[model samples]
Target: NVPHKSSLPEGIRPGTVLRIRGLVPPNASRFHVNLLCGEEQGSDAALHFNPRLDTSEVVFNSKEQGSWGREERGPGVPFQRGQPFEVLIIASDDGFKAVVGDAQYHHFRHRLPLARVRLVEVGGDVQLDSVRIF
Candidate 1:
């Protein structure tokens, strides 16, 4: 699927918090967000955030030249259909910490440098309201 994407302005560095606010569709199967290294569609993704309803899990991975790396699975599902949600991804010295709602959920270790992350993409079974980086 062709997802909704935006190139990160000035790119994301340590201390930056990427916030995404959206609503999950009633029949949602899965939705994902990617932090990319380039504006091109095929560029490497430094971080991939995928939440699946079927498995009730959040899967994280990275891709370079369309090849996926190891998958890091979260503990459990933290989403509800037809409800608004907020996702906060924080960049730090260790890795990226993902917070869904008021609870922190996952931490994805950096296999690729965070400096290469220049784009953000979100799609599937969700209607996004806003994407902001601070």
Candidate 2:
């Protein structure tokens, strides 16, 4: 399995909202993200973009709050490996708004304001050509 992650070469500052659009392989075990703060600069990434762990399932969260560890989720969607997909990420002072497919997945209100997130990583075996931020 391959991993898809974003280095955020420019870096993500607190209260900074960004968007991501690209392809997600079919049969994806789970496409999620983690929001990392602090200056460790280890292997921690940013919040889950649009996590679809289960197949043929979808979950929804109306609340907007939490950091990397704490967030709400909708049901998981079944993903076919190598399936082409696109996602739009909206980062805000409250939380993140992810629009995957025809649904909007909110990560809940943050426990703390985003301090510094430098990278966005995609786990599992997947191929992503690009992630654009506008």
Candidate 3:
């Protein structure tokens, strides 16, 4: 969550919580927050959380060997264009427990090994207010 390289000081494990607060611009088409295998360009992603306004879904999946895997969509997109959102994602023994706003969101089983994720990357048309890990 630092302005410097987005490395996890100590890599994540069970019970790790990654919280992100942001706003989706009115014209935003989509946005993504990724848990990366490493900081290197084209590195694999442990979890790719993408919210698409056009599709109105928050898609989740992993990327490995320069390619994406099967996509998992939450029940619905809890994100809204021109609105603020508070995202809370917690790591469990086998998957991610996500909470968007004040509601419990969907879960995605782990794809890449949890120990392999060392970085975070957020992209797309949203305005990030803050990011925290604790």
Candidate 4:
């Protein structure tokens, strides 16, 4: 989860904990959100994006590791195509904790310890609204 264009709205900061929530469109094959971590960059590798495909698969990619990992949300998670899905993220001291619906997601550690991430891309839709970090 990177900050939206390197800007932090509220309740989000480096080393701070936050929650992510909103609806993701079903037809959205990809998305890009903002990632904000104050003035720290070029040093810390953070978690940037979380993705889902075909309605039952989830993918989490870490900016710190520069890799993509997969998890099975199973074949029953119904995604309404052209509909909106939701997620929640917690920015903790160890890393960023993510939750999609009721499922526990990923842990993106701060390779750049003083940085914060807010943007998240899923599939390939380069546009999104501001993610609320509570």
Candidate 5:
């Protein structure tokens, strides 16, 4: 149950791809990864990627002024408990495209300026292996 968060050295922009690799616990229920505009507590999230093992769905959302916007649910769960998962988040002018494992899975429209996104956070019943942005 480790919660990890970090500030990127530079802001992300169009054409940037953020990669995250992790393993889901055998008893995992859910996990989330967030791209943030600020590192401080209660800051806004530009994108929230959540996978729920119980519901078998992925939820995408945004937070602004401590309020969460409407959720966008992906078609199906692309992760399995005790299995490794990789996510690639591709940035674009209007939104982000997410590829889970090897399949393109979801898209989330930007709720905040992309240039302001400088932080990443991961938490819930999973073990993170690495996170990289390029």
Candidate 6:
């Protein structure tokens, strides 16, 4: 089971990074780390970063007012089953810089703005251990 939720009282600016460490199982289909606009369940998610094992693709999307926006696909799945993955999502002036493992991965423009994000949630088939957020 995977679910860790937290709120940012001060919110985040361009210098902050959300670093996540997780373990993937062999049977995992998908997992996601979300930056939400509110703390309530089903609230808008500013960033939905997911990795799908079945499709070998990392997808990104934004959910605004409980409605999903256009889905965007990142590169391939860099982490394999039984592997411990380390990912960092860095905030910039215009968007977010996704860094998976040690390399710079992908970037998603501010579809719903950045500073408005106030919560973080992780859920899926992956086993999440720690989240480094300030």
Q: CA lDDT, every prediction?
A: 0.89, 0.51, 0.86, 0.45, 0.89, 0.87
Off by over 4 Å in 6: none
Distance from true position, residue 71, model 2, in Å? 5.3
| Candidate 4 residue lDDT tens string, 20-99 | 44445545554533243334443222454535444445443434443333422323432344655556667666666665
lDDT string for model 6 (1-134, tens) is 75888889877788989999989888889889899998777988889998998788999999987789999988777878888999999988888889988899888998987888999888888888798894
- Positional deviation of 108 in candidate 5, in angstroms? 1.1
- Candidate 2 Cα deviation (angstroms), residue 26: 3.9
> What TM-score would candidate 1 get against the native?
0.93
Positional deviation of residue 79's Cα in model 6 after best superposition, in angstroms: 2.1
As a whole number from 0 to 100, the lDDT of residue 12 in candidate 4 is: 53
Q: Name model 3 segments beyond 4 Å from true.
A: 1-5
Model 5 stretches with alpha carbons more than 4 Å out = none
Candidate 3 lDDT tens digits, 1-134: 12223889787799899998889889989888899987788999889888999888889989999999999999988888799999988998898888999998988889888988899777787888888888
Q: Residue 72 of candidate 2: its Cα lDDT?
A: 51
Worst 10 residues of 3 by lDDT: 1-10
TM-score of each: 0.93, 0.61, 0.93, 0.53, 0.93, 0.94
Candidate 1 structure quality by residue, lDDT tens digits, 9-71: 778889999898998889899999899999776899999999998678889999988999999
Q: Measure candidate 1: CA RMSD.
A: 1.8
Model 5 local distance difference test score: 0.89
